[PDB]
Every structure is written in structure tokens, then in C-alpha cells.
Curated annotation (Swiss-Prot), chain A:
Family statement: Belongs to the NELF-B family.
Function in brief: Essential component of the NELF complex, a complex that negatively regulates the elongation of transcription by RNA polymerase II. The NELF complex, which acts via an association with the DSIF complex and causes transcriptional pausing, is counteracted by the P-TEFb kinase complex. May be able to induce chromatin unfolding. Essential for early embryogenesis; plays an important role in maintaining the undifferentiated state of embryonic stem cells (ESCs) by preventing unscheduled expression of developmental genes. (Microbial infection) The NELF complex is involved in HIV-1 latency possibly involving recruitment of PCF11 to paused RNA polymerase II. In vitro, binds weakly to the HIV-1 TAR RNA which is located in the long terminal repeat (LTR) of HIV-1.
GO cellular component, one term: nucleus
Record organism: Homo sapiens
Localization annotation: Nucleus
Key word Metal-binding present: no
Name of the gene: NELFB
Coiled coil feature spans: none
GO BP terms: cell population proliferation; negative regulation of stem cell differentiation; negative regulation of transcription elongation by RNA polymerase II; stem cell differentiation
The entry's keywords: Acetylation, Nucleus, Phosphoprotein, Repressor, RNA-binding, Transcription, Transcription regulation
Keyword NADP applies: no
Protein name (record): Negative elongation factor B
Assembly, per entry: The NELF complex is composed of NELFA, NELFB, NELFCD (isoform NELF-C or isoform NELF-D) and NELFE; the N-terminus of NELFB binds to the NELFA:NELFCD subcomplex. Binds RNA which may help to stabilize the NELF complex on nucleic acid. Interacts with the first BRCT repeat of BRCA1. Interacts with KIAA1191. Interacts with NELFE.
Tissue specificity field: Widely expressed. Expressed in heart, brain, lung, placenta, liver, skeletal muscle, kidney and pancreas.
Molecular function GO terms recorded: RNA binding
Swiss-Prot record, chain C:
Parent-protein start and end of this portion: 91 to 586 of 590
Biological source species: Homo sapiens
Protein name: Negative elongation factor C/D
Cytoplasm among keywords: no
Coiled coil spans: none
Tissues expressed in: Widely expressed. Expressed in heart, brain, lung, placenta, liver, skeletal and cardiac muscle, adrenal, thyroid, kidney and pancreas.
Keyword Protease included in the entry's annotation: no
Example GO biological process: negative regulation of transcription elongation by RNA polymerase II
Effect of residue 435 to Q: Reduces RNA binding
Annotated phenotype, changing residue 316 to M: Reduces RNA binding
Amino acid sequence: XXXXXXXXXXXXXXXXXXXXXXXXXXXXXXXXXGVLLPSLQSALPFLDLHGTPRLEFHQSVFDELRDKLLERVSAIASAEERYKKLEDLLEKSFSLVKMPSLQPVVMCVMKHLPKVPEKKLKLVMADKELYRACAVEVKRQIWQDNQALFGDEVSPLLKQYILEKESALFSTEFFSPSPKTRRQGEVVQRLTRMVGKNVKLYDMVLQFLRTLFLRTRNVHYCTLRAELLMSLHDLDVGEICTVDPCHKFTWCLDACIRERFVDSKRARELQGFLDGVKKGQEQVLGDLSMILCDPFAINTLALSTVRHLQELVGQETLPLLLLLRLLALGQGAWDMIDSQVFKEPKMEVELITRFLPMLMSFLVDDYTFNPESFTKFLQEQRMACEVGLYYVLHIKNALLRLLPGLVETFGDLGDIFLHLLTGNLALLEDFCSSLFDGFFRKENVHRHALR
Amino acid sequence: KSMESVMVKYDATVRNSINQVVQLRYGEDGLAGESVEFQNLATLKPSN
Amino acid sequence: XXXXXXXXXXXXXXXXXXXXXXXXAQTVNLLAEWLIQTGPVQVQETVENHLKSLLIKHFDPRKADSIFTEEGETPAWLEQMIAHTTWRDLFYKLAEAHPDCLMLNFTVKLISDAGYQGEITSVSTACQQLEVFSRVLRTSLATILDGGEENLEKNLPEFAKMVCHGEHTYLFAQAMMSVLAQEEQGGSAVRRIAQEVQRFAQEKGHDASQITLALGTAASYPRACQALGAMLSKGALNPADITVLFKMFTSMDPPPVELIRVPAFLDLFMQSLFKPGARINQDHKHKYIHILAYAASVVETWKKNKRVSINKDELKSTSKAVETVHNLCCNENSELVAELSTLYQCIRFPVVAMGVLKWVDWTVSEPRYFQLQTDHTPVHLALLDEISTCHQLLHPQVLQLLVKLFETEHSQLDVMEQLELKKTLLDRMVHLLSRGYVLPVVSYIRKCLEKLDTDISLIRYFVTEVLDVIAPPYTSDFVQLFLPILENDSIAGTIPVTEFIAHCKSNF
Amino acid sequence: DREVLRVIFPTGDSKVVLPCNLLRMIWNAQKIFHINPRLPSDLHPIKVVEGVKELSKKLVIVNGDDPLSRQAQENATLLFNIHLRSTLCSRRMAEEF
Amino acid sequence: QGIEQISKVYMHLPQTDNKKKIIITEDGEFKALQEWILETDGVSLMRVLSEKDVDPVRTTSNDIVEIFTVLGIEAVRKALERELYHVISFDGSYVNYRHLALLCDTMTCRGHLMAITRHGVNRQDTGPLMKCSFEETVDVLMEA
Amino acid sequence: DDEEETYRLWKIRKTIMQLCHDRGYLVTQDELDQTLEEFKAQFGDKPSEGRPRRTDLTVLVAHNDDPTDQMFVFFPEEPKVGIKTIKVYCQRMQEENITRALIVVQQGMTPSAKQSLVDMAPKYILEQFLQQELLINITEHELVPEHVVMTKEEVTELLARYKLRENQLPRIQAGDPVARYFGIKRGQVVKIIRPSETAGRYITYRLVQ
């Protein structure tokens, strides 16, 4: 029910035609209601002679004058003169908020470069009350105004966490191998819901999502940050990528790790980016959160560590690629447990050398054919290398010898379900795998589905 | 003598005696040449 | 008319429904002024076009007749819809879509009575009433008299198609032409435009010989009129009628020369005599030549009712010239260059020059002609050059033949042979330009430059040949027509021309 | 399909070599079932559209539901499917045939 | 002036629409533009294609070898198709495209140009017996 | 002439931009199609002894998949390129993290330099290109159909669908002009899409050997 001048005229006509006779009054009101250059009265008896529709004519002229030149409205919206014309059109169409404003809202959305917050607050309130169709401009205004866009992003973050939990529960026959291109889902719609060339709102939303995933969230969060960074890099989001100084570089490094998982040049680039980094408060804590929250990145780093251990066992030079992998594991182990400056306490050289010698001895035994103390030390030691050791063991006589070690490590030590599923999918040994699985709700369901 | 052993295999591909594929489908459409006819496309030529 | 429905009810239910519907324009005005600010005339024009589409789209077979049952004076939708330049277009379109409508014909008569014609629409609106057709025809020949020869060449197709829509329309047009042609001044223009209308009707497949024999006072002698009517209707020269006309024209009392000077008869005589594949028998050959000499030689003095002087002194020379050229046309094989000077003295007569022009057209337009020509320039093109030199009335015919040969693709020649043939025809065009026929040739080169795919080297050669023979001063029209072909970015860079562009920049 | 054809044949040469002579088959259908061209037909154009779609589904050169197999099938029958949709369109079946 | 091993160059307007510049007009209609083309005696693609105002898209060759060395194996397959079609259909005869396509695909399946002689057919991995069935039976069997 | 030489350099740079865009490297749209006058304004229009030297025309581009994968486009000044300038280029690459380069040579290289480029090919991938070979884009020729390099998973899925081995495919030489254009090595498969007048479209697969 659009008011304004038209609504006032309708109210006046209703007040005038409120009984009291006046048959000529109704005719005067009908004649006064015919737009300009009164040849419409000349066209009237041409249409009156066969059951006169006036509603058909009015709806037809409204529909053509809207739809045919909404393209012209967009063309004049597509700099200073066009922006001023769009502002004037928005000021004219603001009075028709209760009126149907599909075209009136599209005219303001097309020239939405000037925010105009004095009417923008009322427009945002009306859009929140009436669920307006302004998608991009409405989302940008909601992100820049208050935490309504923050609440919308928190709901999508919870939905993404629930989807990740359901995917972890729904087991299948390699930790869901998918790069940034094929994983376009559940974040491409959220990325399009972002402001686009809105560095401040997108950065605030990313910071809120990272804080929610770190302080009161699992490790499932903070991979959506890498997903949205990859989507913006592939989407040609120049401003958002250029806002983060090292964020684009570490996102490219993460994409290269996800694409291949074995590259010395990528490791050198990551080491060079970490060497000349800023302080741990800004660009260091965020980089640590991006390293820790990446589950697919963590799996790629574990595969790279296994490959580097195999290469070191082949070369027989235990004691820089292994050091780079250890530094990456220490950086991406966890940083959201305690909020503080950027620190990298890691690289146990003696324990790392003891763990690598066990894998080297297992490989040498497997090569020659075609233990418990090392497993106890791994269970009573750093589990970051334990995950890599379990992944290496999961994927003739050497395998039979390492099966008791895998059973001992299974009885020693959340993330082990994915490693066990990968080992079962990659792999006489079936009975040993079933005995290891039965020696321990997602893990039991995965064991039942495997057998 | 160049191509005496080139033939359509049972997966509708065209291969020689070395079992190397020459064409993925015979004549690129997989049709025999004795049952095709000269026809005219009514859409290529006329104006918009 | 919602108020009428309200007053004709105040069942009540449908009445209240219609009332609420009517109570359910100004927003369109607000959108229009917002678009005017964002943009004026285009918005109202598009609104009127959409209104015209809505009025046209459904039907109107009898409702306007029903409102005209009360004789339909009604200036409310007549004067509002009679002079806004767009509603009359709607009425013309409606009359074209629905012919024989009384109200549509009334509106056509009303828009014609205000002198607001300008749309042809020859099917329904132009030729339905005598008044409307008379007024649109008067406007048409006023335009064709004001425009000149360029407007003649640009406007005889649609105008002659409109006046030949019916035999009654052709009869009325020829009636106006016959009445106007007897005026002491300006009757030659009326006779000319009547002749192009008559030849358009002839080439449209309709017989128009009866009209031009009856309305052109040629029915004074019924025997000669009947012979000429059979001549023009049959489309060939028969011995019986030429013997009748020859024996009548050699009598003591000569008939008027008007019926023998009909251009259709003379063109058909050109078809009969100067065709290379024609063998006229000798017993009627001299009759043919004497008929042509009488038709194009005599000097007759007329004072408002009769004649007293007819000159036959030039008849002997004209007959000798036509006989010599007809002997050359029946000679075919060289023997043409052997006595070509005599041929050029016969070309000095205009009727002989047009006969030579038609013979050159038939000799050259025949395929495998330039393939059998060894010399750089054919002799018949030089005959065209002499025709252009001796006479200026044949210049449109020369240009028509030249553009016919220039547009002809000779696939039997080498590409360089085709190029030098086009250069030779273009040299004849340059000669025609130098002999006073300037503007149509430059117009044709302008047509060849942008909307035709002719060789740019040919246009450059034309510019080089023209600028080597012309000197200042130049008129405004020639400069305005010759400057754009010299500034086309495919001519100026490769191609003195600096003096010409300096003179055009300093003067125009 | 017209744009694809004008890419495939840059010269406007419409004489191609294709398996089923569709014009002769339409003429055979007209003669067999005694089609009167002067009368309105009882053939719904939506049945023409869905029949052409199902027929194009039936003509298989490359088996398989793989994306590779589907692309090879679409490529192998591209010209014939264009000719089939052009000849057996709704407007032509309504007016000409 | 000019390019070595390009002895004589002729210029002519094409007659058939095979070499005419065919364009699609604004109303979606095919129009055959008659434009100048140059036919040479002697071949060098790579220098001529680099020349100013020479179309690097449509300029082709009769020479199969230089098309292979300049434009590649798929381009020489297409050029071999066009040359064989020309030499077959010059006299108005017609051969189905299946056979021409199969011959060109057999001659171009191995990356290089496989000549139909003893020097292209007896040099692939076709086995000793079918190689010796063609030519140099004693030499092929001696090598085997 | 000298403006002819800078026109030739602009054409070579145009072909290099098109080649690097086709190879998957990040090439901006304005660089992909810059006019001759933009080349003259940017580089100097006088390559005889003035501003646009061959050293100034060196192009560094990065891949769209990883910024670590970068590639040089070196333009030697000398017509005939020897061992020492190759060693200079290898030194320039070894002080960076860039292992791919195109060497757009004017005259043909010495055979020692060519076999040298063969020698460190597993370590540094250096591709030599003649000046004549880059004055046009061969992929824009009407005889050359569309060549698309297939990823390794695409190759495995292709060989799994038709149940054929790698050697059963038709092959393409590594010295093919299109294979050199796309910079594809042995064991890599290129898919070729060309129009057909019997089927409409045909896709064939060639394996580099």
C-alpha cells in the first residue's frame, strides 16, 4: 500500500466519493485520474466499443515502461553524472517503499556507489523488516553497518562446521582428496554473499570466523578462510588479495601444496615468506591460524613429510627439506589454544631423529625381505609426528613386522579416525587391520562399514 | 599395402595391426559410407 | 466510461466490482519525468508507439462504423488524432489492413482534405476515392516537377507504381497529363513525365498503347491511328502498317507529326532496325528509313489550329545517314574502321546517334565480345565517346551503358584484362565527365566507393584522370561530391591532389 | 545450432552427407498415412519437441554415461542432431510437413 | 627485393567461392567478397606469413613438408586432406570423406609424416612379415 | 629500417603474450593486446641504438596455478647465441627461484649452445625460439585446430575409458611447432578439437614422444 502523493490522492478520492450523491464527482475523479497531452481521451472510445479494459492498458503501460528501459536505467548506472542521476532516482523512489519497488530498488542498486546513510539507515531497516531483494548492496550495507552480516556469516560458519562433521561421519573409500577448484561448494555462495570489492567488511568477517573457529570452535574452522581466499584468488578479487600482504603468498603456497604435495620450490617459497614475516600479532598469528585450521592443508603437509622421510631414508642423510617440514608442522600444529605473540616451539631434533630411524629401519627390513619401543615413544611423545608415522604405516615381511607396531600405536593414542580410514582404504593384512580396529561413534561406524 | 590391417574394432574404434588407434570413431561419426546421403541444412544459409 | 457504468447502475455486485476496479497514470508521469531528468521526446514517442500497437493489435472491423451510424461528426477524437503526425500513420495502416471500411475511408478523406498527405500506401489509401487520389497525385507530380532529373530517376519507381495500381488510376493520371500538356509553357515536362509513366506501364506488363493513342489527339485519322495501335500493341514492326504510314506520309496532304514522334514507336523502331541480328528486306528498308527521316527531320510551324510550313530539306541527309549506318549494322564483319569518318559524320545526327548507341549496346553487351577484341580500347567505346561529344541529351544513356559494362563481371577474361577493361570504361566515364555530364558520374563513383566492392585502384585511377584534366574554379556541388572520395583513407594516402585539396580547403 | 553450423562451415555450403534422408522420410510419412496438407493437423508441437529429444537420446554412437563418453557422443552426432532438430522442428511440422 | 626461392608471384581474383572471402553480414547472411589473392611459384611459408598485410590465418601452401615443419602435424593432416580432396575432385568426381580422412589419419598418426613408400611403411612397428610382404623382403627379414 | 624493427619487436612481444596466456601464465589483458603505438610509447621506437634494447624486452610471468612457477622470456642482443650468454641466463635464473625460460633468438643458435640447453633440461627448462617463428601465432592459423593440454588425471581417465595404453594413442613430436608453442614434454597428452563435416565435432588425443 504505497502512500506518498499517489496514496494521498487515493485517500482524497476515497473521501470525495464517500456517498452524499455527486454522480458528476465520480466522473470528474475518473477524468482527473490520461497522463499528459490529452490524446488518451481521443483513444478512449476506440477501446470503449468492445468491453473497455482500463486495468489492462494501465498494467501494460506500467510493465513496458518498467521492463523495457530498466536496461536504460542500468546503462546510465554503468561517472559523476551517472552517480548523481542514480542518487536522484533513489531519492525519488525512496517514497515508494510500500509501493512495489522492484525497478525502484534496482535503480538504486545499480547506482549504489554513494551509500547515503541518512536514508540508508531507513532503507536497511525497511529491508530487514520486509526482506528486500537488494542482495549485493544490501549485504555490503549490512556488513559495513553492524553485525547482522556477522550473524549471517556465523550461521554459514556453523553450517559449514555441521557439513564437515557429517562428511567426517559419512565415511567412504584418502581424506576426501579435492583441490581448491573442485571444492567449490558451501563457500562459493558465501563468497558471492560477500561484498566483493569490500576489503574492510570481508576482513572483519574473516577475523570473526577465525576467532570463532579458534577460541570456541574446532579445527574444522579456519579451512573456510583458505577456501574463501582461494575462491577470491580464482574470482579475481584484487582488492581483498592485495589487502593481505603475505596472505596471498601463503594461499598460493597452500594451493601448490594441495595440488602436488611434493615440491622443493614451494617449500623454499614458504620458508622465504616465513623468514621475512612481520610480528606475531599481525600477519603472524593469522598465518599460524591459517596453517593450523587447514585440515586438507594438514593432510598435504603430512603426505609431504612422509615423502621427505622416504627421500631421506633413500639418501641416508638423516640430520633442509625435513627441517622445513618440521618447521611447517610446528607452525601449523596449533595457535588458537592460547592467544599470544607468534612463537614456534617445535623441532625436537633427538625425538625426530629417533622417529625417522624407526621408519628407515622398517623400510630397510621391507626392502631386505622382498618396533614396540619406537611405538611406545611415539605414543608417549609428539603426536604431530605420530600422525605422519601412522599415515606412512597405513599406506612383505616388513609390513608384517610393522603391523604389530601399528597395533601398539593404535592402543596408545580425534584425528585418528581419518588416518585409520585412509589406511584401511589403501590396504592376510585384512585380519590384522580388523584386529587393530576392534581393539579400540564415528570410529565404530567406520569400522562397521569397512567390514 | 599402407593400411590393409586398419579396421573397425568391436569398441567402434579404428585401429591397425599394432592395436594403435587411428580414429576413435570411423569417419569421426562411426557410420558406414554406403548408407549416407547428400542432404541440405536448412539453417546454415538463411538470414536472421 | 466507468462513470457511465456507474450512472447506469446507481446488478449491484458487478457494478461495485467495476467501481473498485476503476478506483484501483500519475506514477507513469513520475517515471516519465524521472527518465527525462536522467535522459525527452523519445519517451513520449515510445509511449505513443506502444499506444498505437495496442490500438492496432486486436481488431476494428465495424465499431467505428457503429459510432459513425450517427454520421460521426465528433471532433473530440478527430482533431486530437488528426494532426499529431503519428495517428494518421495508424489510420493508414488500419486502412491497409482492412480495406473497404466506411469510417477508415472517411478518415482518409479527412486527412487528405487537410493537405496532410505524404504516405504512398498505394494499395488501399491512395486509390480508393477520386478526391484522395487526385490530391496525392497532384502532390506527386508537383514533387516530380520541382525536383528535376535527379528526382525523376529517384522517384519514378514508387510514383509510377502508385499511378499504375489500377487502369482507372492510370487513366486519371494520363488525363491530367493530356490536359496539362497542351499548355503553351511547361508542357514538355508534363509530356516527359507522362512518357516515363507510360513506359513504366508498358514494362509492367499492362497495355497502355490505347491510352496514349486516344488521349494524345492522334485519332484524327482512324486508319493511321489503328495501324499505329497495332504497331504499339504487337511490339514489332510489321510491313503492312509501315506501308500504310509511308503511303500516307508521301501523300499531298501530310498528317501531323505528333503520332509518328511517339517515343515508344521510335524505341521499337530502334529494336527493329539497329539490332545486329536483324535482316530487313530491301522492299521495305527504304520505307523504314524514310519513316524515320520524316519522324526526326521535318520542321513544322503551327499557329493554334493548323500548319503552313513543313521542311523536307534535312530529310534527304537524315535518310542517307540512317541508310549508311544500317548498312554498317548489316555489314557486321573489320571493314568498320575503313570508312569510320563517314560513320562519325552520321553520328552528328541525334536519332542516328541513338541508333548507334543501341547498336553498340547490343554489340558490346553480348558475351564473349571483349574476349575477341585485340586492341587496347574497343572501337565501339570510341563510338560512345563520339556520341557523348556530339550530343548531350544522350549522356544518361551513355552513363547507363557504361555502368552496365562496369558492373558486368567478365569471367572469361584475365584479371589484369578485366582491370584494364574497367580502366577503359572508366576513361569513357572521364570523357563523359569532361563533356559536361559531371554530377551523375561522380555520384556513381561515390556509390562505387563505400556501398560497392569495386577495386580501390579503379577509384584512384578515376581521381588521377579527373584531376589531370580539371582546373579551378569549381562549383560547390562538384566539390561537395568529389571531396569525400579524395578523403576516404584508401585514396588520399596512396595518391596533383595537393593543389586540389588546398583549393577546396581555402575556398570551401 | 545455427551458430555452431556457421562455425563448422565458414562457407555457406549446406550440402552435407548424413545418414537418414529426413526430407524423403517425411515425404514417405505423408504418402503412407495420406496426409492432407490443406487440413489442420492433430500433431501437438510439444510432442514434436519431446519426440525429437527422445530420438536424439536414442541415436547412440559412443556408449557410456561418463562425461568423456557423453562428450564423444555429443560430438559424433552433432551434425545429425542439428539437422534433425532443424528438419523436425515444431514450426516446420506445423506448416510445411 | 623479395624472398629467396619465391620465383614468380601471380595475383588474381578468385572465381569459385573456395578462395573468396566469405563473411556473415549484419543480417546473418553469407556474402562472398572478391578480394585479391597471390599465388607464388616456390614456397617459403614462415617468411611470407610474417609479412605486412599478409593474412597469417588463411595463407596456406601446396607443399606438405613445410606445412608440417611450420604449422605442425594436425595442420599438415588438414592440409593433406585439402590437397587430396583437390586432386580427387578437380575432375568433378566425389569420394566419401571417410576414406580421405582415414588415409590422412594413417599418414599422420605417428607424429611425423609417414610416406606411403618403403621409407614410411616399412619403418614402423608393424612386424617383420607384413613389412616383407610389401617390399625389400630379404632386407626386412635379414634385419629381423 | 628502424621502425620496421620495432614493429617486429612489438609483434614478437604480442606472440609471447599470447603464448604465455595460452600456456596458463598470468598475462594481463592490456598486455595481451597492446597496439604498436603503445609499444613505441612504452619502449622507445628506436631499437637501433636507442631505448628499446633486447635486454629491456625481457618478460617475467607467473603461472595462474602457483606463483612459484614463473617463467622468463629472454631476448638476446646477439644474432647467434653461444655458450657464455646461456651461462649468463642460467646465472640470472639461479639467483632466483625460476627454472623456466624462453630464449627468443634472432639467428639460429650454435649447436654447442643447443646441446647445452639439452644438458641441464631436468634442472632448468630452457626453450629456444627463433625470431621468425614468433612473428605470427601459428595457433591462429586456420589449418591449426585447438590444442588443449590435458592434466594427468584427465590422461588417466582417458586411458581408463577407452582401455588403451599410452603407446596406442596417436603421437606428436616434441619438436612439433604446436608442442613447442605449448611447451609440452614427452609423456604428456594434448587433446585436439577440430570441426568435421561428417560429425560436426571431433576430439582426438595426441601423446608427446
